Design a protein around this ligand. Structure first.
Ligand SMILES: C[C@@H](O)CCn1c(=O)n(C)c2ccc(Nc3ccnc(Cl)c3C#N)cc21
Ligand SMILES: C[C@@H](O)CCn1c(=O)n(C)c2ccc(Nc3ccnc(Cl)c3C#N)cc21
Lengths: 5, 125, 125, 5
């Protein structure tokens, strides 16, 4: 996996 | 919202599962006929990957057909390679199939495939 | 072949197009009912993203239903957020919805969502 | 984009 897009 | 988190591998995981559904012939709703040769697929994936299928399946009459016959000049191997690319992101481009793949991608209106085919041909000149 | 080239953005481009089809209500083939609230979707995308929908639409009788009613304990907002995640890879997780999102992801059998929900809850303890 | 996977 999870990221800040 | 602008505060969403994103799972990086999600799109690839979905595509992998759609290809497993195709392999197992699950919820396939169209047969594409290319000369002698029949290919079962999901209309949504074909529309998502091709300007030709997007035009076909958004037509009020053709959206209902369960069989689509392609132009007899289309090569079944070229179509097969492009159908695999649609469901996997991998294109099996080889010296012996590049002309047929490019002609099929032009017909199917797959812009990115046509561009790479052109680049590989230009490098071989 | 082991000699394929790969278009990096393909899976994401397909998913974007499937979400545009959903927005425009094109070739949607199921309505998911969550209490008062109805959501139109593509059975293939739901199966690709959820162990629950994969079990439902591979069943010889349920594969034919055009309406699926979820358990009345399921929160429609939680379902809506998960349906958007399925079609976009982006999860709108907020303090005010995380419990409902996690309970809905457990019911729908979405493993990656459940794991991130658990991590965000554990950080808030 | 195109890469060697
Ligand atoms: C996936 C990526 O490589 C693009 C593939 N592709 C091309 O090359 N053309 C010309 C397309 C032309 C159209 C489409 N499909 C769509 C375009 C607009 N809106 C929606 Cl909802 C779809 C669908 N389904 C894909 C095309
Ligand atoms: C996309 C990724 O996040 C995984 C989502 N997901 C989960 O979490 N479970 C438990 C699934 C359980 C099942 C599935 N769906 C499939 C699994 C096997 N073969 C096929 Cl063809 C599909 C389909 N369609 C997705 C699941």
């Amino acid at each position: 996996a999870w990221v800040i897009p | 919202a602008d505060s969403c988190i994103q799972f990086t591998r999600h799109a690839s995981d979905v595509l992998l599962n759609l290809n497993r559904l195709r392999s197992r012939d699950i919820l396939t709703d169209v047969v594409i006929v290319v000369s002698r040769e029949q290919f079962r697929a999901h209309k949504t994936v074909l529309m998502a990957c091709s300007g030709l299928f997007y035009s076909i399946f958004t037509d009020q009459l053709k959206c209902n057909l369960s069989v689509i016959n392609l132009d007899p000049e289309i090569n079944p191997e070229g179509f097969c390679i492009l159908l695999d690319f649609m469901y996997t992101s991998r294109l099996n481009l080889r010296e012996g199939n590049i002309m047929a793949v490019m002609a099929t991608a032009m017909y199917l209106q797959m812009e990115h495939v046509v561009d790479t085919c052109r680049k590989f041909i230009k490098a071989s000149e």
